[PDB]
Amino acid sequence: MDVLSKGSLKELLAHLEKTPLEEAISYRIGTVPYQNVLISRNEYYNQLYPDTTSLIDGVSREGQRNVNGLIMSIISYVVSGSGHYIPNIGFMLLRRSILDILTKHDTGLVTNNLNYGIIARNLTVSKMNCEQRKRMLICFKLLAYKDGNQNDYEIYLNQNIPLKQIAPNFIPGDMRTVIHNQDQLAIVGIPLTQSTELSIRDDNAKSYKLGYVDWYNSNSFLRERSEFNLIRLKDRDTKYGKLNGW
Amino acid sequence: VGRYYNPFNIDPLTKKHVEDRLEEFINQVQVGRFRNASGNAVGTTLAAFLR
């Protein structure tokens, strides 16, 4: 809910630096990602409404234990607000922040073999709005410059002309580009009636939209009560035990 | 939501009385003969009051 309200590249990057990977992942099994299902939308139809599940719905789904699974969960969190279920990630990765997973080499994750075309297909980029595509391209560009695969990012953009039109105009190394960026990446925001939408993505997105006004006021006190005497998880000092399976 | 009769039998759309022959009717009374066979002011007095 907080990641969706960020409307600037500066605010989105600042949030990712503060947020650990734990809130990008989820601990709920969910269902299989791609599946033709019939859902009940009684506000419109007596019959069951056909739809296809995906990873863009704000609902947890099963993900494999690999770098592709971790990347998909991070992007889904940015573009949808809810991550995926990757089993037993490990303490060392969960304590790192999202941006360091995307842009730093000390995390212990190899991302040199990522295929951008396959990730977009798996994330169903076709059923994404303008804001979501921009956020996905921000994550792709950060990974591309981290591993030196800047050429592959350009090849992917050239193959997808519509994405090339709305691509972000920032260079990850430079800071002048981030300061002067003028993109609008906000998905949720204060304005809508308490009604139901037909699609799973549209219904879940509207649920975030209607709950943002209430979340703006109620989160302050309830949060502060939780970590009144709690040590911050992000970059927590430890004995640096091990990283298993990566 | 309610309804009420417009006072004095006036249609707001027309802005006049409901009867469309009132001017002709008043002139008919003015030139009429009432209550006597001979001349009298009954027709003229009633026409003035009606107007």
């Binding site: 003028q182 204060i190 | 802005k15």
Partner: protein
């Protein structure tokens, strides 16, 4: 009684004169000191301005830019702007205010 009449009325010269001044009042607002659009931007954002007059940091633009830094400038109406509670976040990126005089 006269409401809704179809009586022809001759347009006199004085009516023609005032209709001309009224039309140019709406059409050319800058001549009379009012405008229907303003833009607020942070100082670090470089916006093209009118350099004909030699002013220092001229507040006058030839036309309010459609795009800045490759992206379209946000447009917010005055009524929505007045009712906003997150104006601090919105004003950080700069916007255009319209729907008011």
């Amino acid at each position: 009684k006269l409401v809704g009449h179809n009586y022809p009325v001759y347009v006199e010269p004085v009516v023609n004169i005032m209709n001309f001044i009224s039309a140019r009042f709406v059409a050319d607002s800058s001549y009379f000191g009012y405008t229907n659009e303003i833009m607020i931007m942070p100082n670090h954002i470089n916006v093209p301005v009118d350099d004909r007059f030699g002013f220092r940091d001229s507040p006058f633009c030839t036309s309010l830019p459609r795009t800045i830094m490759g992206n379209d400038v946000r447009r917010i109406s005055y009524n929505v702007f007045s009712m906003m509670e997150d104006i601090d976040d919105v004003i950080s990126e700069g916007f255009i205010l319209y729907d008011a005089y």
